[PDB]
Amino acid sequence: DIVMTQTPASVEAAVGGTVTIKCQASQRIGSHVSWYQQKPGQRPKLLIYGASNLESGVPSRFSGSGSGTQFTLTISDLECADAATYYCQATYDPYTGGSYGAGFGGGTAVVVKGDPVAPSVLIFPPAADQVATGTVTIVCVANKYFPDVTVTWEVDGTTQTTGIENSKTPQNSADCTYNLSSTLTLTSTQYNSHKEYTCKVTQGTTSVVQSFNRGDC
């Protein structure tokens, strides 16, 4: 079994920069290495095979190098569309002598540093039919922003430590921005036992706060 050691596990580079990713095979496999690109929710996409052959239709800014033990993927002129995770794969096993695609490297998460954009924030009070079910879920959305943000929930001035679930969209392939949804789940009893609900999205030294009063919605 060929084992591939990928470095680094994650990298961040400015638009137009150069990303250098490398993999290490546990024993010499010549030029038998493929590189893949994968975005969230999508199937893997082949970029390089045979260590340095570009798959048809793949931009020329991707290039692979290496033969033997150490293999290198280079991404130059980095674009927002290149925000993804990249995997190497050994395509030869000297023990079995087969040239099939085998073990994958750990992967490298590439974050493309685009131009900074502060978020706009929206808070959505629970629909009327929610509270009858025994639980309520308050949604808070931070749209189109970069760099990352941190969310803080408050209920009548008390910071919330539990009931919080966050999901971030992948980097927009055009402008590198993120979108985030933060949900706060409480019981119907807890929800009716409080008035003020606050979502606070912090991007460094900036914060956008979005509140609502349960009685007014």
Partner: protein, 218 residues
């Protein structure tokens, strides 16, 4: 192309047969058909390959015990797995590795994968709730509306708006999983106010469910 099927929600300790079906070509030619899985939010993990010419098989050392690959027909390769646990929850991709001349390293045909969810919970259809600004707020000329898709098992659900005609300004977030194992996600869309009555189309195929919720501000 390649299409995986046979998956879904299954209980721990059970066994499963996933099939990979080919169209526009068959396994009478010389290829490798490999299975690669990916747990949600984690890396790719090779399971094994089978050579279509002589049905010779090659497995990852970790996968030998619980996984089996076989060519059941000229157009179907099956992946049998045993003693499933939560650690086996993953998307199981089928991939074809073609001949480059001296080797078979050209893995440029991948299926979308078959999702296997190993849980003891029962399948559950989502509860769809509208998302609109607080009634007491002064409306603006542009408004963001959405749908909360709460408490479904297993993945996935797909959300469209106005049956797929409203696609500009749509932001459908990836699903979150709470402690009890139920999934939830939201989808919002920015539209002009006092203008568009929008409708989300939430599909949960695992329960053969589709829900349409027409949302409106205040």
């Amino acid at each position: 192309q390649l299409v995986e099927s046979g998956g879904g929600l299954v209980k721990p300790g059970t066994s499963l047969s996933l099939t990979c079906k080919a169209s526009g070509f068959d396994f009478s030619d010389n290829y490798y058909i490999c299975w690669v899985r990916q747990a949600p939010g984690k890396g790719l993990e090779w399971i094994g390959c089978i050579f279509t010419q002589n049905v010779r098989t090659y497995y990852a050392n970790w996968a030998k015990g619980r996984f089996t690959i076989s060519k059941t027909s000229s157009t179907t390769v099956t992946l049998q797995m045993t003693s499933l646990t939560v650690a086996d929850t993953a998307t199981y991709f089928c991939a074809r590795f073609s001949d480059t001349g001296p080797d078979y390293g050209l893995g440029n045909l991948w299926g979308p994968g078959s999702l296997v969810t190993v849980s003891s919970g029962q399948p559950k259809a989502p509860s769809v709730f509208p998302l609109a600004p607080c009634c007491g707020d002064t409306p603006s000329s542009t408004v963001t509306l959405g749908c909360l898709v709460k408490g479904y098992l297993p993945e996935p659900v797909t959300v469209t708006w106005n049956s797929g005609t409203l696609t500009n300004g749509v932001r459908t977030f990836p699903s979150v999983r709470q402690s009890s194992g139920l999934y939830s996600l939201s989808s919002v869309v920015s539209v002009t106010s006092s203008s568009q009555p929008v409708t989300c189309n939430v599909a949960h195929p695992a329960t053969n469910t589709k829900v349409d919720k027409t949302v409106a501000p205040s």
